Design a protein around this ligand. Structure first.
Ligand SMILES: Cc1cc2c(cc1C)N(C[C@H](O)[C@H](O)[C@H](O)COP(=O)(O)OP(=O)(O)OC[C@H]1O[C@@H](n3cnc4c(N)ncnc43)[C@H](O)[C@@H]1O)c1[nH]c(=O)[nH]c(=O)c1N2
Ligand SMILES: Cc1cc2c(cc1C)N(C[C@H](O)[C@H](O)[C@H](O)COP(=O)(O)OP(=O)(O)OC[C@H]1O[C@@H](n3cnc4c(N)ncnc43)[C@H](O)[C@@H]1O)c1[nH]c(=O)[nH]c(=O)c1N2
Ligand SMILES: O=S(=O)(O)CCS
Ligand SMILES: O=S(=O)(O)CCS
Ligand SMILES: [Mg+2]
Ligand SMILES: [Mg+2]
Lengths: 522, 522
């Protein structure tokens, strides 16, 4: 049936419960119909998909005084992020970091004895499944009651043409379409890939009905592969990462990458470069029993009953491209100009549908910029020079140039880092800050307290790049990147007010060198 | 004896070991003499004290090409920070944060049963004592080998006059003195204050030779009292805080302060306002057995064998003031103009010695600006418009105006916060980020996932204040404050690249409102 929700006003937690019920419904659940049928204005845009791009684009268009409609096949707004992407990933990475701490200090202070202890993966996935309706509920509530958005949920949109969309058995006209249906999990064209026990980010939180055995094979080297792999390792499982190219290439600074990889290997992870799965072996019960892959050292066969695919996502372009005549790129991404316009008049495309980088900032901003163009503002969007981050068992944050990259680009450079390059190497009690204090003080753990570096042009004194391994700097890199894009010098960094003990020591270490006209690394 | 270390080059860990040896030596240890006997220049400045202010001032003065000498009675540089202040505080706050997590999820997932579990305060203090030599060693190493500093350590300075200081049985002349001896813990004029079992931050890490009983009394209601009190509570002890006025007045936003206090009370802390200790009772062996205090509801007696004094620190000005004739302020602080000059020609004063704000960003800056003035730069310093932070079992970060403060000042304001103002209140699954995911997803724990807010001028669209309770925002507030001092608007905030799931949600929540010319709270 169709639930006309326009004049109902559920709380956040009532929404959480209602969304849970609809997801539970054997028949698939009612359509959530939240349309202002008394507003006579034409729709400025209909958004196909209500994930990060469609939801933020709708919020911005409505804020500018335009009329929008979201259509989404899920009964909640927010798309993959709350249901199977950014949110669960963060729950698992929280677990990975806490578990590394517990295993390092096993049996000390309040920490349990972790020797032999295998943590239940299904237990944590079930926690996520039991709690994910909370964020769903906030999405539906905030969108309807605070952002004044119109939306039809739990209903696939049927695009008829570049001005016409069917939803909930009704036809809606709009001045523009904004295509925001995202991307689907990448898959592997090998025998056995459909065996029971092979999972991706989407299927893991829907179909995990058993506790994995002692070994996990992760396919891929993407952020998702590394984040999930470190969680699986932290639960106590032999974890083999089959990377197609080079592991963690995203970390351009060689010293930072080496520190991160070394810490992963110290936790027991096996990282295989240049590897390609050739077969997933099934046992007679139809479950994965082994993974066979070609590697630089020959064929490798790993016995396992649990495989996690962390491959690149694939834009959901096929049906829309057939209906509308959209020009597509080599990976199936919808091609757009710098105004987010597709090859089809009055059709924009945003978010993961337009390809990399597939990040939340890109999805939300492309949605908003498409909205501004729909509302008559000529505004271009090309994502460039952004900060980035990934989880291992640490938070890893980076922006700008790595040290070698900056030298190769012609810059005379100095660096300011922690710990310093000395005979004792990493085995010193800095850097140290919130959630690295036990590492900094424990017996033999000082090398685990983190790593960080800024790359500086020796003559202009400008900061060219920043790199951090530890905890609590990720949020800072958002604002620091803005400052660096403005032309931040080592002197200006030293002039700031630090909040000691700080995750990034850049401010005070810069101050220690900024008094000299001829800069020297620290 | 006097160890001429000038031409010795110890590693960091060799320094750590040597400092331990000197500290434990019954005779008091050798003097550490690191003076350049070939330099014919007069010292531009002698720094009395080698804490944050003296060490950073020396580093900056040397970097500008001047000559400096540090004299400190400790055998290490860095002052209180590594020995008994910021560093141990952060170790304690880390355990409190980890212990709140463990108690909340006691007996779930990998967490042991925290019922019946009292964590050893002495074990954690002993961990700090065993590891504090690491930072000591880095301080001495970095100062000598990387910063090119001269210093005499493990030797009290005798200031003879405004150009003359004796140290290690030698007389040194200087163009200027920079007084950097810091501040010492305040005391309580009540019977029993010397009883065994009364500690402050300094004596706690030197004299704790027993494991405290089940109750702790903390005297005071600002940063140090609150940070240590939450640690004591997290170890499983009934913790009663006796606050003279009202607690956490530094948190100006009323909702933020209420969230912080509410979460402390939910952990079991008892916060008694308007209370004054009357007596600390000693048993027949000279050990604390109870605290008697007057409260607005009359006298109360609390049985305890452990009292922690978290009173404001007192500038160490008496001896120097009498020697030099320094003008002092009402709190014993040394009075300085905006160039850090005392009333005595060629004598500057810096750090905690000059009073509030007693922070690591103040002492460092003050000492650096004093150095620059000594070297011929007329540069003023008045600490103002800076971010601030404290620990409870959370990290608490704040800058600028609270909401009520801004409205009382005539500003038309909007606020953008998380969680929203609704019937469900805090009992919703946002805000959520690293180290709050378990709270956001746990049964009955969502209200523990944090609280955050920005205060915005509705007409200029400028951010007037920002407030956050959670984890991983402290470092960001350093750089966010700089942007706000430049004139940050909600539109510019919305234009940034966020790194989802971010500790501060200010970027994307701003984006949700910035599309309207008439701003609306969220
Ligand atoms: C495992 C994992 C982990 C992360 C991330 C991804 C993944 C897979 N990401 C990336 C992030 O999730 C991604 O960039 C955005 O969610 C994409 O938002 P979109 O709205 O463009 O797509 P998204 O796919 O979210 O939106 C599509 C929406 O449209 C709906 N839809 C599809 N077809 C439809 C149809 N025919 N009719 C109606 N509705 C339809 C879908 O149901 C969905 O609601 C991330 N990013 C980041 O910044 N930080 C991070 O930590 C992570 N972590
Ligand atoms: C418990 C606790 C916790 C914190 C903090 C304080 C306390 C008590 N602080 C405050 C911070 O510690 C403080 O602002 C600085 O350490 C002050 O540095 P100074 O160099 O000014 O004094 P400090 O006292 O550190 O330096 C004095 C030095 O001079 C020496 N000296 C003294 N008299 C001498 C004499 N006659 N002859 C020779 N040498 C002499 C001393 O031995 C010492 O080495 C803080 N700040 C912050 O930013 N973040 C935080 O988290 C905390 N946390
Ligand atoms: O970007 S959205 O707020 O829509 C989803 C956050 S998980
Ligand atoms: O500020 S100092 O570098 O001197 C001490 C930091 S622990
Ligand atoms: Mg280290
Ligand atoms: Mg909450």
């Amino acid at each position: 049936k169709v639930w006309n929700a326009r004049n109902d006003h559920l709380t956040i937690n009532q929404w959480a419960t209602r969304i849970d019920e609809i997801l539970e419904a054997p028949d698939g659940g009612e359509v959530i119909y939240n349309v202002d049928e008394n507003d006579p204005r034409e729709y400025d845009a209909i958004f196909i998909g209500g994930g990060a791009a469609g939801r933020f684009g709708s919020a911005y268009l409505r804020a500018m005084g335009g009329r929008q409609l979201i259509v989404d096949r899920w009964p909640f707004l927010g798309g993959s992020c709350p249901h199977n992407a950014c949110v669960p990933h963060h729950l698992f990475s929280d677990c990975a970091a806490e578990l590394m701490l517990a295993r390092t200090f096993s049996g000390q202070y309040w920490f349990p004895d972790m020797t032999e202890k295998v943590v239940g993966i299904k237990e944590v996935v079930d926690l996520f499944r039991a709690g994910r309706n909370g964020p769903h509920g906030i999405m539906n509530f905030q969108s309807k009651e605070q952002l004044n958005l119109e939306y039809i949920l739990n209903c696939p949109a049927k695009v008829i043409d570049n001005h016409t969309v069917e939803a909930a058995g009704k036809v809606f006209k709009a001045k523009n379409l904004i295509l925001a249906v995202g991307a689907g999990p990448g898959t592997l064209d090998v025998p056995g890939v459909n065996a029971k026990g092979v999972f991706d980010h989407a299927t893991l939180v829907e179909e995990l009905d058993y506790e994995p055995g002692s070994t996990v094979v992760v396919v891929g080297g993407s952020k998702t592969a590394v984040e999930y792999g470190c969680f699986f390792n932290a639960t106590g499982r032999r974890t083999v990462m089959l990377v197609r190219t080079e592991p963690l290439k995203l970390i351009k600074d060689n010293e930072t990458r080496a520190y991160v990889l070394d810490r992963m290997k110290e936790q027991g992870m096996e990282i295989i470069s240049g590897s390609n799965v050739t077969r997933i072996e099934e046992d007679a019960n139809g479950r994965v029993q082994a993974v066979v892959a070609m590697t630089p050292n020959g064929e490798m066969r790993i016995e396992t009953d649990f495989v996690f695919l962390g491959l690149g996502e694939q834009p959901r372009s096929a049906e829309l491209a057939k209906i509308l005549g959209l020009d597509l790129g080599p990976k199936g991404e919808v091609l757009v100009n710098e105004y987010l316009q597709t090859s089809v008049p009055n059709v924009y495309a945003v978010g993961d549908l337009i390809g990399g980088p597939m990040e939340m900032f890109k999805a939300r901003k492309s949605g908003c910029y498409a909205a501004r163009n729909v509302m008559g503002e000529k505004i271009s969007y090309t994502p460039k020079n952004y900060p980035d981050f990934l989880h291992t068992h640490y938070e890893v944050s980076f922006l700008g140039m790595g040290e070698e990259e900056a030298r190769a680009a012609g810059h005379e450079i100095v660096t300011i880092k922690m710990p310093p390059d000395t005979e004792n190497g990493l085995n010193v009690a800095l850097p140290a800050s919130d959630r690295t204090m036990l590492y900094a003080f424990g017996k033999g753990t000082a090398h685990m307290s983190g790593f960080q570096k800024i790359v500086i042009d020796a003559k202009t004194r400008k900061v060219l790049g920043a790199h951090h391994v530890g905890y609590g700097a990720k949020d800072a890199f958002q604002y620091l990147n803005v400052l660096i894009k403005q032309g931040l010098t080592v002197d200006e960094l030293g002039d700031m007010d630090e909040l000691h003990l700080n995750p990034t020591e850049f401010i005070q270490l810069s101050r220690l060198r900024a008094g000299s006209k001829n800069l020297v690394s620290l």
